[PDB]
Protein backbone atom coordinates (compact mmCIF):
# COMPACT_ATOMS: atom_id res chain seq x y z
CA UNK A 1 0.00 0.00 0.00
CA UNK A 2 1.75 3.11 -1.30
CA UNK A 3 0.91 6.59 -0.06
CA UNK A 4 1.37 8.86 -3.05
CA UNK A 5 1.09 12.53 -3.96
CA UNK A 6 1.99 14.64 -6.98
CA UNK A 7 5.50 15.74 -7.94
CA UNK A 8 6.70 19.27 -7.11
CA UNK A 9 5.24 21.29 -9.97
CA UNK A 10 3.29 24.39 -11.01
CA UNK A 11 1.32 23.31 -14.05
CA UNK A 12 -2.09 24.39 -15.37
CA UNK A 13 -5.02 22.46 -13.88
CA UNK A 14 -5.78 20.87 -17.26
CA UNK A 15 -2.37 19.17 -17.30
CA UNK A 16 -2.69 16.05 -15.14
CA UNK A 17 0.12 14.86 -12.87
CA UNK A 18 1.99 11.92 -14.37
CA UNK A 19 4.72 11.67 -11.72
CA UNK A 20 3.46 10.43 -8.37
CA UNK A 21 5.82 10.75 -5.37
CA UNK A 22 5.11 7.60 -3.36
CA UNK A 23 6.26 6.75 0.16
CA UNK A 24 5.97 3.24 1.53
CA UNK A 25 7.07 0.81 4.24
CA UNK A 26 9.79 -1.20 2.55
CA UNK A 27 11.67 -4.22 3.92
CA UNK A 28 15.16 -4.12 5.44
CA UNK A 29 18.30 -6.27 5.22
CA UNK A 30 17.12 -7.66 8.56
CA UNK A 31 13.83 -9.49 9.05
CA UNK A 32 13.44 -7.62 12.34
CA UNK A 33 12.96 -4.16 10.88
CA UNK A 34 11.26 -2.06 8.22
CA UNK A 35 11.89 1.23 6.43
CA UNK A 36 9.62 3.98 5.17
CA UNK A 37 11.25 5.12 1.94
CA UNK A 38 9.98 7.09 -1.05
CA UNK A 39 10.16 6.62 -4.81
CA UNK A 40 8.69 8.21 -7.93
CA UNK A 41 6.22 6.39 -10.15
CA UNK A 42 4.42 7.16 -13.40
CA UNK A 43 0.61 7.35 -13.25
CA UNK A 44 0.44 4.25 -15.45
CA UNK A 45 2.55 2.20 -13.04
CA UNK A 46 0.09 2.76 -10.18
CA UNK A 47 -3.61 2.47 -9.38
CA UNK A 48 -5.72 4.27 -6.81
CA UNK A 49 -6.53 1.82 -4.05
CA UNK A 50 -9.45 2.50 -1.73
CA UNK A 51 -8.95 10.94 3.25
CA UNK A 52 -5.54 9.64 2.15
CA UNK A 53 -4.51 9.30 -1.50
CA UNK A 54 -3.09 5.76 -1.46
CA UNK A 55 -2.03 3.64 -4.44
CA UNK A 56 -0.51 0.32 -5.47
CA UNK A 57 1.70 -0.98 -8.27
CA UNK A 58 -0.69 -2.05 -11.03
CA UNK A 59 0.77 -5.56 -11.33
CA UNK A 60 -0.24 -6.48 -7.78
CA UNK A 61 -3.54 -8.10 -8.87
CA UNK A 62 -2.53 -9.40 -12.28
CA UNK A 63 1.02 -10.73 -11.90
CA UNK A 64 4.30 -10.88 -10.00
CA UNK A 65 7.23 -8.57 -10.69
CA UNK A 66 10.99 -8.97 -11.30
CA UNK A 67 13.49 -6.12 -11.64
CA UNK A 68 15.65 -6.33 -14.78
CA UNK A 69 19.38 -6.28 -14.03
CA UNK A 70 20.81 -2.85 -14.97
CA UNK A 71 23.87 -4.87 -15.86
CA UNK A 72 21.91 -5.96 -18.96
CA UNK A 73 21.02 -4.18 -22.22
CA UNK A 74 17.88 -3.84 -24.33
CA UNK A 75 19.68 -2.72 -27.50
CA UNK A 76 18.58 -4.74 -30.55
CA UNK A 77 21.73 -6.22 -32.06
CA UNK A 78 21.73 -7.94 -35.49
CA UNK A 79 21.10 -11.69 -35.46
CA UNK A 80 21.74 -14.15 -38.31
CA UNK A 81 19.77 -17.38 -38.60
CA UNK A 82 22.18 -20.02 -39.87
CA UNK A 83 21.03 -23.41 -41.15
CA UNK A 84 22.45 -26.83 -40.22
CA UNK A 85 24.38 -28.87 -42.77
CA UNK A 86 22.38 -30.27 -45.67
CA UNK A 87 19.93 -27.44 -45.12
CA UNK B 1 14.72 13.56 -7.50
CA UNK B 2 14.10 15.13 -10.92
CA UNK B 3 16.93 17.53 -11.64
CA UNK B 4 15.66 20.54 -13.55
CA UNK B 5 12.40 21.15 -15.38
CA UNK B 6 9.51 18.73 -15.59
CA UNK B 7 8.85 18.21 -19.28
CA UNK B 8 7.10 15.74 -21.57
CA UNK B 9 8.45 12.76 -23.49
CA UNK B 10 8.03 13.05 -27.26
CA UNK B 11 9.22 12.22 -30.78
CA UNK B 12 9.82 14.38 -33.87
CA UNK B 13 9.56 13.48 -37.54
CA UNK B 14 9.78 15.79 -40.55
CA UNK B 15 6.32 16.84 -41.67
CA UNK B 16 7.87 17.22 -45.11
CA UNK B 17 9.16 13.66 -45.39
CA UNK B 18 6.05 12.16 -43.77
CA UNK B 19 3.99 13.98 -46.40
CA UNK B 20 6.34 12.62 -49.06
CA UNK B 21 6.35 9.03 -47.79
CA UNK B 22 2.62 8.94 -47.07
CA UNK B 23 2.22 9.98 -50.69
CA UNK B 24 4.24 6.95 -51.77
CA UNK B 25 2.01 4.47 -49.93
CA UNK B 26 -1.07 6.03 -51.54
CA UNK B 27 0.39 5.71 -55.04
CA UNK B 28 0.89 2.03 -54.24
CA UNK B 29 -2.44 1.51 -52.47
CA UNK B 30 -4.50 2.68 -55.47
CA UNK B 31 -3.09 -0.28 -57.39
CA UNK B 32 -5.33 -2.44 -55.19
CA UNK B 33 -8.42 -0.29 -54.67
CA UNK B 34 -8.86 1.68 -57.90
CA UNK B 35 -7.40 4.75 -59.58
CA UNK B 36 -10.33 7.02 -58.67
CA UNK B 37 -10.31 6.42 -54.92
CA UNK B 38 -9.97 8.40 -51.67
CA UNK B 39 -7.45 7.00 -49.17
CA UNK B 40 -7.36 8.90 -45.86
CA UNK B 41 -5.49 8.04 -42.65
CA UNK B 42 -7.06 7.81 -39.18
CA UNK B 43 -5.84 7.09 -35.65
CA UNK B 44 -6.41 3.91 -33.61
CA UNK B 45 -9.98 2.72 -33.04
CA UNK B 46 -9.40 1.63 -29.46
CA UNK B 47 -7.78 -1.04 -27.31
CA UNK B 48 -4.78 -1.70 -25.09
Amino acid at each position, epitope marked *: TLQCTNVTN*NITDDMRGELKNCSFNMTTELRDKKQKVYSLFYRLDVVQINSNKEYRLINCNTSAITQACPKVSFEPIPIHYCAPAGF | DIIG*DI*RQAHCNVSKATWNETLGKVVKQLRKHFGNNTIIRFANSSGGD
Partner: antibody
Amino acid sequence: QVHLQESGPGLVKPSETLSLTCNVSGTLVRDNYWSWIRQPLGKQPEWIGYVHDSGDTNYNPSLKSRVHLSLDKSKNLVSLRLTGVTAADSAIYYCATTKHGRRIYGVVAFKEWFTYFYMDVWGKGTSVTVSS
Amino acid sequence: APTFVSVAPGQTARITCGEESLGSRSVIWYQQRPGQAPSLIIYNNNDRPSGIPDRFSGSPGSTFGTTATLTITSVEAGDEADYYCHIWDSRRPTNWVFGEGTTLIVLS
Protein backbone atom coordinates in the same frame (compact mmCIF):
# COMPACT_ATOMS: atom_id res chain seq x y z
CA GLN C 1 8.98 61.45 -21.58
CA VAL C 2 7.16 59.12 -19.17
CA HIS C 3 6.64 59.47 -15.40
CA LEU C 4 4.36 58.44 -12.52
CA GLN C 5 2.98 60.04 -9.35
CA GLU C 6 0.97 58.25 -6.64
CA SER C 7 -1.47 59.85 -4.20
CA GLY C 8 -3.67 58.86 -1.27
CA PRO C 9 -5.43 60.04 1.91
CA GLY C 10 -2.50 59.13 4.19
CA LEU C 11 -4.47 57.68 7.10
CA VAL C 12 -7.15 54.99 7.52
CA LYS C 13 -9.18 53.64 10.46
CA PRO C 14 -9.33 49.86 11.12
CA SER C 15 -11.74 47.95 8.84
CA GLU C 16 -12.26 50.61 6.16
CA THR C 17 -11.78 51.11 2.42
CA LEU C 18 -8.26 52.13 1.40
CA SER C 19 -8.24 54.04 -1.90
CA LEU C 20 -5.29 55.18 -4.03
CA THR C 21 -4.67 56.82 -7.42
CA CYS C 22 -1.62 57.32 -9.65
CA ASN C 23 -1.04 60.16 -12.14
CA VAL C 24 0.29 59.13 -15.54
CA SER C 25 2.51 60.96 -18.03
CA GLY C 26 3.67 60.40 -21.60
CA THR C 27 2.00 57.03 -22.21
CA LEU C 28 -1.59 56.05 -21.32
CA VAL C 29 -3.45 53.31 -19.45
CA ARG C 30 -4.73 51.27 -22.41
CA ASP C 31 -1.23 51.06 -23.83
CA ASN C 32 0.42 49.41 -20.82
CA TYR C 33 -0.18 47.02 -17.91
CA TRP C 34 -0.39 48.42 -14.39
CA SER C 35 0.67 47.09 -11.00
CA TRP C 36 0.96 48.09 -7.34
CA ILE C 37 3.57 47.25 -4.69
CA ARG C 38 3.37 48.06 -0.98
CA GLN C 39 6.36 48.13 1.35
CA PRO C 40 5.93 48.13 5.15
CA LEU C 41 8.52 49.74 7.42
CA GLY C 42 11.85 47.92 7.28
CA LYS C 43 10.56 44.97 5.26
CA GLN C 44 10.69 43.53 1.75
CA PRO C 45 8.08 44.69 -0.79
CA GLU C 46 4.84 42.78 -1.43
CA TRP C 47 3.42 42.62 -4.95
CA ILE C 48 -0.24 43.66 -4.74
CA GLY C 49 -1.68 42.83 -8.16
CA TYR C 50 -1.87 43.78 -11.83
CA VAL C 51 -4.43 45.35 -14.15
CA HIS C 52 -5.01 45.88 -17.88
CA ASP C 53 -7.90 46.24 -20.31
CA SER C 54 -9.56 43.01 -21.58
CA GLY C 55 -9.84 41.49 -18.11
CA ASP C 56 -6.18 40.65 -17.59
CA THR C 57 -6.49 41.66 -13.94
CA ASN C 58 -5.40 38.93 -11.51
CA TYR C 59 -4.44 39.70 -7.90
CA ASN C 60 -2.32 38.53 -4.97
CA PRO C 61 -3.93 35.44 -3.39
CA SER C 62 -2.68 36.44 0.08
CA LEU C 63 -4.69 39.66 -0.20
CA LYS C 64 -7.61 37.63 -1.52
CA SER C 65 -11.09 39.19 -1.68
CA ARG C 66 -10.65 42.58 -0.03
CA VAL C 67 -8.57 43.98 -2.90
CA HIS C 68 -10.21 45.42 -6.04
CA LEU C 69 -8.14 47.05 -8.77
CA SER C 70 -9.74 49.23 -11.45
CA LEU C 71 -9.14 51.97 -14.02
CA ASP C 72 -10.31 55.29 -15.48
CA LYS C 73 -10.07 55.53 -19.27
CA SER C 74 -11.05 59.16 -19.85
CA LYS C 75 -9.25 60.72 -16.88
CA ASN C 76 -6.27 58.42 -17.56
CA LEU C 77 -5.31 57.33 -14.04
CA VAL C 78 -4.77 53.98 -12.32
CA SER C 79 -7.04 53.10 -9.39
CA LEU C 80 -7.05 50.83 -6.32
CA ARG C 81 -9.59 49.77 -3.68
CA LEU C 82 -8.80 47.72 -0.57
CA THR C 83 -11.37 46.78 2.09
CA GLY C 84 -10.99 45.48 5.65
CA VAL C 85 -7.85 47.52 6.29
CA THR C 86 -5.73 46.68 9.34
CA ALA C 87 -2.34 47.39 10.94
CA ALA C 88 -0.71 44.90 8.56
CA ASP C 89 -1.70 47.12 5.64
CA SER C 90 0.43 50.03 6.89
CA ALA C 91 3.05 50.54 4.17
CA ILE C 92 4.40 52.90 1.53
CA TYR C 93 2.45 51.97 -1.59
CA TYR C 94 3.75 52.17 -5.15
CA CYS C 95 2.23 52.30 -8.63
CA ALA C 96 4.17 50.97 -11.63
CA THR C 97 3.90 49.89 -15.25
CA THR C 98 4.50 46.17 -15.44
CA LYS C 99 6.15 44.69 -18.54
CA HIS C 100 5.51 41.04 -19.42
CA GLY C 101 7.66 38.37 -21.07
CA ARG C 102 8.05 34.67 -21.91
CA ARG C 103 10.56 32.22 -20.43
CA ILE C 104 10.83 28.94 -22.35
CA TYR C 105 12.52 25.73 -21.17
CA GLY C 106 10.76 23.05 -23.22
CA VAL C 107 8.30 22.81 -26.10
CA VAL C 108 5.90 25.73 -26.52
CA ALA C 109 3.05 23.55 -27.81
CA PHE C 110 3.41 21.31 -24.76
CA LYS C 111 2.88 24.57 -22.84
CA GLU C 112 6.30 24.29 -21.22
CA TRP C 113 6.91 27.96 -20.44
CA PHE C 114 5.64 30.71 -18.17
CA THR C 115 4.67 34.38 -18.30
CA TYR C 116 6.93 36.63 -16.22
CA PHE C 117 6.46 40.35 -15.64
CA TYR C 118 8.79 42.93 -14.17
CA MET C 119 8.05 46.57 -13.34
CA ASP C 120 10.40 48.98 -15.09
CA VAL C 121 9.24 52.43 -13.94
CA TRP C 122 7.92 53.32 -10.48
CA GLY C 123 6.50 56.43 -8.86
CA LYS C 124 7.71 58.39 -5.84
CA GLY C 125 5.64 56.67 -3.16
CA THR C 126 2.43 56.71 -1.14
CA SER C 127 2.78 56.83 2.64
CA VAL C 128 -0.31 55.19 4.12
CA THR C 129 -0.78 55.04 7.89
CA VAL C 130 -3.57 53.13 9.62
CA SER C 131 -4.40 53.91 13.24
CA SER C 132 -7.49 54.66 15.32
CA ALA D 1 18.07 38.27 9.77
CA PRO D 2 19.31 41.54 8.16
CA THR D 3 22.16 40.54 5.82
CA PHE D 4 25.09 42.73 4.77
CA VAL D 5 27.80 42.77 2.10
CA SER D 6 31.00 44.83 2.32
CA VAL D 7 33.81 45.45 -0.18
CA ALA D 8 36.56 47.96 -0.99
CA PRO D 9 36.06 50.55 -3.75
CA GLY D 10 36.83 49.37 -7.29
CA GLN D 11 36.37 45.72 -6.33
CA THR D 12 33.65 43.29 -7.39
CA ALA D 13 30.90 42.51 -4.89
CA ARG D 14 28.64 39.47 -5.01
CA ILE D 15 25.10 39.29 -3.60
CA THR D 16 22.66 36.36 -3.31
CA CYS D 17 18.89 36.27 -2.86
CA GLY D 18 16.04 33.77 -2.59
CA GLU D 19 15.36 30.04 -2.38
CA GLU D 20 17.59 27.46 -4.12
CA SER D 21 16.66 26.77 -7.76
CA LEU D 22 14.38 23.93 -8.84
CA GLY D 23 13.65 24.37 -12.54
CA SER D 24 14.72 27.03 -15.03
CA ARG D 25 13.80 30.49 -13.78
CA SER D 26 13.65 34.13 -14.69
CA VAL D 27 14.91 36.29 -11.86
CA ILE D 28 14.27 40.04 -11.62
CA TRP D 29 16.59 42.25 -9.57
CA TYR D 30 16.02 45.68 -8.03
CA GLN D 31 17.87 48.38 -6.09
CA GLN D 32 16.22 50.33 -3.27
CA ARG D 33 18.18 53.54 -2.82
CA PRO D 34 17.42 54.56 0.82
CA GLY D 35 14.67 57.16 0.59
CA GLN D 36 14.06 56.65 -3.12
CA ALA D 37 11.98 54.02 -4.90
CA PRO D 38 13.05 50.51 -5.95
CA SER D 39 14.83 50.62 -9.30
CA LEU D 40 14.73 47.78 -11.82
CA ILE D 41 18.35 47.00 -12.61
CA ILE D 42 18.09 43.54 -14.23
CA TYR D 43 14.98 42.08 -15.87
CA ASN D 44 16.05 38.81 -17.48
CA ASN D 45 18.52 36.68 -15.52
CA ASN D 46 21.26 38.94 -16.89
CA ASP D 47 19.59 41.55 -19.12
CA ARG D 48 19.94 45.26 -18.38
CA PRO D 49 17.86 48.13 -19.82
CA SER D 50 18.90 51.76 -20.33
CA GLY D 51 20.06 53.85 -17.38
CA ILE D 52 21.89 50.90 -15.85
CA PRO D 53 25.36 50.05 -17.20
CA ASP D 54 27.56 46.96 -16.97
CA ARG D 55 28.65 45.03 -15.16
CA PHE D 56 25.76 44.09 -12.91
CA SER D 57 26.26 40.40 -13.66
CA GLY D 58 23.80 37.75 -12.49
CA SER D 59 23.08 34.04 -12.26
CA PRO D 60 21.67 32.58 -15.48
CA GLY D 61 18.31 30.84 -15.14
CA SER D 62 19.65 27.70 -16.78
CA THR D 63 21.02 26.14 -13.57
CA PHE D 64 19.35 23.89 -10.99
CA GLY D 65 20.06 23.25 -7.32
CA THR D 66 21.76 26.63 -7.46
CA THR D 67 21.38 29.98 -5.73
CA ALA D 68 20.55 33.26 -7.46
CA THR D 69 23.51 35.64 -7.42
CA LEU D 70 24.07 39.27 -8.45
CA THR D 71 27.66 40.29 -9.15
CA ILE D 72 28.51 43.99 -8.95
CA THR D 73 31.79 44.78 -10.71
CA SER D 74 33.91 47.91 -10.17
CA VAL D 75 31.94 49.23 -7.20
CA GLU D 76 31.54 52.89 -6.27
CA ALA D 77 29.89 54.93 -3.50
CA GLY D 78 26.70 55.25 -5.53
CA ASP D 79 26.26 51.48 -5.68
CA GLU D 80 25.57 51.38 -1.94
CA ALA D 81 21.89 50.47 -1.51
CA ASP D 82 19.45 47.68 -0.62
CA TYR D 83 18.74 45.03 -3.24
CA TYR D 84 15.86 42.64 -3.94
CA CYS D 85 15.12 39.73 -6.27
CA HIS D 86 11.96 38.36 -7.87
CA ILE D 87 11.79 34.65 -8.64
CA TRP D 88 9.85 32.76 -11.30
CA ASP D 89 10.49 29.02 -11.09
CA SER D 90 8.97 26.69 -13.69
CA ARG D 91 8.28 24.30 -10.80
CA ARG D 92 7.26 26.65 -7.97
CA PRO D 93 4.28 29.06 -8.10
CA THR D 94 4.25 32.84 -8.60
CA ASN D 95 6.25 34.68 -5.93
CA TRP D 96 4.08 37.58 -4.80
CA VAL D 97 6.66 39.26 -2.55
CA PHE D 98 10.20 40.21 -3.49
CA GLY D 99 12.82 38.04 -1.81
CA GLU D 100 14.49 39.34 1.35
CA GLY D 101 16.91 42.22 0.96
CA THR D 102 20.69 42.17 1.04
CA THR D 103 22.17 45.58 1.79
CA LEU D 104 25.49 46.53 0.20
CA ILE D 105 28.08 48.68 2.00
CA VAL D 106 31.38 49.60 0.31
CA LEU D 107 34.50 50.25 2.45
CA SER D 108 36.68 53.17 3.56
